[PDB]
Amino acid sequence: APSYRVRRADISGHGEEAVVNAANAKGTVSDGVCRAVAKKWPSSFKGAATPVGTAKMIRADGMTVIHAVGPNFSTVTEAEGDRELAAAYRAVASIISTNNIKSVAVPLLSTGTFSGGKDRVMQSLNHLFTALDATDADVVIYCRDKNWEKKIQEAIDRRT
């Protein structure tokens, strides 16, 4: 059984065994979590392009980086994006499990420039739970916002 906690902090300062990048399909550096990951582990982007709804792992710069591509909700229907977001987190969980990764720092996929102008924190979080529940990892959810942190914490507590 996995554990979940939430941390309001820069994901690049995480204390876990692996980190999930909120990647884009082309493997390019963009603002936010992605830029933080690229500054800290710059060689982790080599060959990281992966389709929407999948994830791709690399060991680089003494870190395990999982590039997970959630959908851009401007470019898919609502139901399609929901399916793709679910798949992205399932791909993450698969990488966690198959590589015996014991703790992981995870951002909320598709919540920023990919959100298509809708609040997706809870949508993303609930897919995160469903997927990583298949694992036994200590999951640390990273956010920047004090509003989000309490919301996520409530959600974790509601499960307890």
Residue numbers in the entry: 1 to 160
Question: How do the authors describe this structure?
Answer:
In this TRC, nsP3 has been for a long time the least understood nsP, but recent studies revealed some of its functions in viral replication. nsP3 is organised into three domains: a macro domain (MD) at the N-terminal, a zinc-binding domain (ZBD) and a C-terminal hypervariable region (HVR). Macro domains can recognize ADP-ribose (ADPr), poly-ADP-ribose (PAR) in their free or protein-bound form, or O-acetyl-ADP-ribose (OAADPr). In order to better understand this mechanism, we initiated a structure-based study of the Getah virus (GETV) macro domain, which shows a peculiar substitution for one of the most conserved residues in the catalytic loop, namely serine replacing a glycine in position 30. We produced the GETV macro domain for crystallographic studies, alone or in complex with ADP-ribose, and documented several conformations adopted by ADP-ribose in the binding site.
The crystals of the GETV macro domain belong to the space group P212121 and two molecules are present in the asymmetric unit. All residues from Ala1 to Thr160 are well defined in the electron density and the model has excellent stereochemistry with 99.2% of side-chain rotamers in the favoured conformation and 99.7% of residues in the favoured Ramachandran plot regions. The structure of GETV macro domain consists of a central twisted six-stranded β sheet (strand order β1, β6, β5, β2, β4, β3) sandwiched between one α-helix (α1) at one side and three α-helices (α2, α3 and α4) at the opposite site. The two molecules present in the asymmetric unit are virtually identical, with an r.m.s.d. of 0.22 Å between the two chains. A comparison of the overall structure of GETV macro domain with the structures of macro domains from other alphaviruses shows that the alphavirus macro domain fold is very well conserved. In particular, the Cα chains of macro domains from the three Old World alphaviruses GETV, CHIKV and SINV superimpose well, as illustrated by the low root mean square deviation (r.m.s.d.) values of approximately 0.7 Å. The structural homology of the GETV macro domain (OW) with other alphavirus macro domains such as VEEV macro domain (NW) and the MAYV macro domain (OW) was slightly lower with r.m.s.d. values of 0.9 and 1.4 Å, respectively. With respect to the closest human or coronavirus macro domain structures, chiefly consisting of a central seven-stranded β-sheet flanked on either sides by three α-helices, alphavirus macro domains lack the first β-strand, and α-helices α1 and α3 (SARS-CoV annotation) are degenerated to 310-helices or reduced to loops.
